[PDB]
């Protein structure tokens, strides 16, 4: 349930249902921690109170 900063998208792929999945390089870690994440896991965050 926590959110981690994405440093780089290293690879993409389409599943059987035609939706995209991205191989995520997580900031602060190396290539061993890369994970394929569904498209909707990528979030843009802005300040909530301004």
């Amino acid at each position: 349930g926590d959110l981690y900063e994405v440093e780089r998208i290293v690879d993409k792929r389409k599943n059987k249902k035609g939706k995209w999945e991205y191989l995520i390089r997580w900031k602060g870690y190396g290539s061993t921690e890369d994970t394929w994440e569904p498209e909707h896991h990528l979030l843009h965050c802005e300040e909530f109170i301004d």
Partner: peptide, 6 residues
Amino acid sequence: XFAFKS
């Protein structure tokens, strides 16, 4: 950006 790690 950020992403869920699931």
